[PDB]
Structure 1
Amino acid sequence: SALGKLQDVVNQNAQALNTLVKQLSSNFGAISSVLNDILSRLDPPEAEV
């Protein structure tokens, strides 16, 4: 617990990157989080929306 500042900086950056990667896998109100399945299941207007 002496190198807390550098470890905290590294942990914050890693947490930000991991949060970004997890947030990539969010629906945001869409049918699915993957675009290929959305294209396969839906017609072009609804899939585009």
Structure 2
Amino acid sequence: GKLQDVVNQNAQALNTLVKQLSSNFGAISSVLNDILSRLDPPEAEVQID
């Protein structure tokens, strides 16, 4: 278990990290290129930020 746990923990963290790319954080969308292709820089700047 002690080794296995280690692996899982690291793997688990990575998964969480990756999943965090699917969150809006308040932006209009979680996809960068979506905003890049929908708004001009003066407004897309805020979402991207």
TM-score, scaled relative to structure 2: 0.83
- The percent identity for this pair of structures is 100
> Which residue of 2 is the match for residue 22 of structure 1?
19
User: How many correspondences in the alignment?
Assistant: 46
Unaligned segments of structure 1, at least 5 residues: none
Runs of 4+ in 1 over 2 A off after TM superposition: none
CA-based RMSD: 0.9
Counterpart in the other structure of 2:40: 43
Aligned with 1:32: secondary structure?
coil
Larger Rg: 1
Structure with more contact order per residue of length (Cα contacts < 8 Å, sep ≥ 6): 2
TM-score, normalised with respect to structure 1? 0.83
